[model samples]
Target chain A: DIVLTQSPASLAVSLGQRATISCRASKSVSTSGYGYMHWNQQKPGQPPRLLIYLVSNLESGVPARFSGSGSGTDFTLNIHPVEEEDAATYYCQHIREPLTFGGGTKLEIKRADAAPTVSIFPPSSEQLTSGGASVVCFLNNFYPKDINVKWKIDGSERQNGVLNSWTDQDSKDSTYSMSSTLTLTKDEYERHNSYTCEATHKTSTSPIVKSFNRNEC
Target chain B: DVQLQESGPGLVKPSQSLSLTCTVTGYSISSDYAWNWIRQFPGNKLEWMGYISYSGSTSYNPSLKSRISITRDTSKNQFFLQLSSVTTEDTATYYCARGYYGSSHSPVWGAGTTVTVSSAKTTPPPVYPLVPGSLAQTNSMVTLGCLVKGYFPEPVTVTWNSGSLSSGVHTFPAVLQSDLYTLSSSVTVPSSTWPSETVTCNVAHPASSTKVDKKIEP
Candidate 1:
């Protein structure tokens, strides 16, 4: 199977600005004088809608603002003068046997006043006294919905036992919210260590962090 | 208002014909659209098998042209697919959809049904004994190569007798040709161990369910 790598996991552009997403296949997807690359647009709570077929041919009923180009291993999907309704996740697929899809790229309208509110909550006293404890970090009211969360123990980054939840959008406000949880064993909880949650949002220049210490509890 | 539902046998024996029926609702079989059959392999690889048009014309993927047939029964408002001489590779989740010719867009799709080929003949990979390579050989270390080819289903395990190796070990992805897969793996070891310690390449594949070990000496 040919693997496809899509770049710019998330793109933030102003209304009427051009947005370009790239997809590169591990091997050439062309055969018999035709490139097999295709593109799809998927909005939330909807099935994927085909946008381009055979590399550059636009599907019927699609707008002229959306176009695709390139062939073989390298391909591009361009949305010129992106509209607010064009905010969705885009994916690339190849028609080869053992077919594969590129990791989706999310397109969002750029805005300035959409920073997130981050907070961390320690495990309850009853749960902390048990064999295992969990600390939860909540990020609320963020714009564009694309954010990264990381966990650190006493200033050192940690990867294991950290679960980042999926983003949820507010229907009325259109803002997004998500959470991340860090699991700790009894020994680590008893040691009264400090756990920090760092959130990086596109609106912010630096990561927002919140810390929880068992000693305070 | 078009709807499609696919039905077929969940299990089919190898070397036999596999048939599937696609029943449509809210649309006429002789209408202005084409009804198509598509399948997704286990690894999420999708293929457009074939389609029967409203005017009764048929088209199929060239890869399966020799072994595929598409027909319909207008009175029943349904279409059918008959794929002959089945193999394990044909196992997939089959779907029926409304496809556009030339554009290749499927706007409506049926809930897919999975079909598995039962007791297909499995081809065990043949393991070639490890050979010392002259290209990467130095005074301190030597490289050995092993080739395993002609296997089915594409999942094979290759290992060395020297325990878990991390560095200086390279295993190329399996390449498929004529419906069979081939793979090569190489390992580097200290020159002092060669010709003294018998380095063996162990190959395990699902087809044979047994380990094949090829040892190298001098």
Candidate 2:
């Protein structure tokens, strides 16, 4: 079974502030010769709504603003700017395979009248000396046809380091789960707070902003 | 468009077996696939009854309980399905398919072949449960049933009679279509030990690939 982990648990983003979520796979989603990648959204008791179908093909009637990009095991779901409706539990799912789910990143508004469109999750750093922790961020209830995640240098909008992207989610939670990661180094460990894991759910929205933070033992 | 079709008589007499075949063009059996057999009955749905790979490694729906068998005649490049001692309820249309199982690939179902039951046996079939019965009697024991039906969409029927509650994976034998047969299985739980515990006997077919589950009376 694929396991998905979300970071930030929650986030505070501004209206129209780019929001992103990450969905990662334990095992490669490519199995039996097919890529079992898909993104969906859930609103509490509602069934998962398909956002991204297939690895990168957007299903019919899907929002064009939402795009997806990634491959194999690591992937991201970037939501442009973000929208009020995009604030829900996002999950990444695999088809015709063992069902796994990410705990999910809940994107909601902490402000007045203006609900956060998309909230990027904090990046993954060394939580405790070096255990494996996968962080996938996403809007619960939306899909991104083209998604990408990378360990981005904070404050430096120019360089993207260690890009291992994947589109198909190895799990399902009725939401689009996507994110990026980097092995924490002694230097980065000291600056983990300065790094960011930007989640871009689509080609439309600017990558959502999530500060950096890894968990503890 | 390359054409492929499934054909088999819809009805079979009691204590007898069900059979079906699929014909293909613009493609050959050696073309990479375990041509399959899937089926469904009336007022119900489809099942991944069983499949035969070109390489000869085969897996059948567990519910077939050794009551089914699948074989291929390379001479004819065709696969076969058989279900024995079937009841009227087993009536369903069986289909043939070119399939790839256990992968992320979606199922490519044949138009379909339906198999329906003509009658159920009055006496418990003597060939099955070779030991008469091995159901679990304790809540500690449990039974599990799983099956998949395909191959140009042939129909299949799988059932189990643990009698009591049995455990430790009891295997059942089923007679599939003539020239071909496969084993399927079912588990039964104890009536005294289970009320919330579930021992299901499911009939799988292709139309909807629907599963019918019957819980044991605990």
Candidate 3:
């Protein structure tokens, strides 16, 4: 299998803006006589359809606005004045030997509900000052879970935060687990009526999980 | 390495459509393949029929949308191309080019059979048939046509050239009636090449000269 890599996971495209998709082949896709470079569109849920085949030749019944041009190791799929229905993911594949695919680039309409989602689990607690003080929060699914856990009060969002670190478990399903510690004063624990610990996962497409109305320190 | 053959009708009466089927004896259509249909005229000038994947997904030459149907039947390990509303213009020898099955280069091909479409004999014995509408030309647009007399139901591409019908606006599988088919390609060339220059029309198929370039003198 030919190794493929894509960059800049997401982009914001204005309507009618030309969206360009690039695919780099591990080796030159061209042959002595023939071998064309090309791109394809996998709109939302449907199977990946052939938007362009044989490099520059426009597939019959396709709109003229879409075109392709490149050879050897590099190629591009260009959509001129992208259409409204064109909001979908784009992928590049090699027609050369042992056909391979690039991780797709999804084109989507920006929405207000597009904020990142996160889920936390296994509410665990750790000791600090015996029974008097203990730090408890939750573990999350997003990978490489080393994060700065913040125990905030009054929704201020800027109080001192705790830093916890974790490493992924070794196996086919690579998952990580970690925790943080938050010390509390007698009065600090008393006034901590509304405390939340937000965990920010720092990886591409990795979700950010936060603990709302966290248990007392 | 397996061999395939296309056994379709040899001729069709005028006013009737043409159809052809390709049968494969050695290989399996389910084993990830891309099959293509190509055609040639009286002489052997190849034209690229379009391709269909094993998944029933299709990509045609745009020219055959209305008149050509390249389909596959996994149950029978065979595929077919049906041309509807064919006329004398749709006559041509069609061949099925087995696109790459295993390797990329050296595409496997099948021996083609000729299918001819001629007009039904009219009761009036001495009637001189009228020619089709002459090539339509204007400032930048010029339309040229290729009418195959034999029907192979294979995929053929008609490109416009400057010498005959080389390049311009192009159409494929224009069904005048059920048995007759016409492909008209038009191009908006510069005014300089419009009326003076010759446009060449070439159909790229699988074998023999990729295409026979015709001199379309406007």
What proportion of the real contacts between chains A and B does each prediction keep?
Answer: 0.03, 0.08, 0.00
lDDT string, candidate 1, B1-218, tens digits:
78788888766678899999999999888976678787867432556787888889987877788999999999989999999999879987788877654334345778777786866346787665444323334356666656665676545788887455645454555655356666666666788778777788888985457578888754
Over the stretch A158-200, how does candidate 3's per-residue lDDT look in tens digits?
A: 4442333342232222343443434344445545555455655
Our model 2 lands, by Cα RMSD against the true structure, at: 23.7
What's the TM-score of chain A alone for every prediction? 0.57, 0.46, 0.48
Prediction 1 TM-score vs. true? 0.46
Total backbone collisions, model 2: 122
Return the top candidate by DockQ.
2
What is residue A170's positional error in candidate 2, in angstroms? 39
- Over A1-217, each residue of candidate 2 has an lDDT whose tens digit, in order, gives 3465544456556447656666676777744356556565645323345577455666564566566567677666666766655656666654333334455565654332211122232222322334422222222223432455544555554233232322222123212322233433455545544455565555446766655433332
In angstroms, how far off is B59's CA in candidate 3? 23
**Comparing 2 and 3 on lDDT, the stronger one:** 3
Off by over 4 Å in 3: A4-8, A111-217, B1-75, B78-218
Ranking by lDDT: 1, 3, 2
lDDT of 1: 0.70
> Which scores better on DockQ, 1 or 2?
2
TM-score of chain A of 3: 0.48
DockQ of 2: 0.04
| Candidate 1 off by > 4 Å | A1-12, A18-40, A50-81, A89-106, A122-132, A143-149, A152-157, A165-178, A186-194, A200-207, A213-217, B5-23, B30-32, B37-96, B101-218
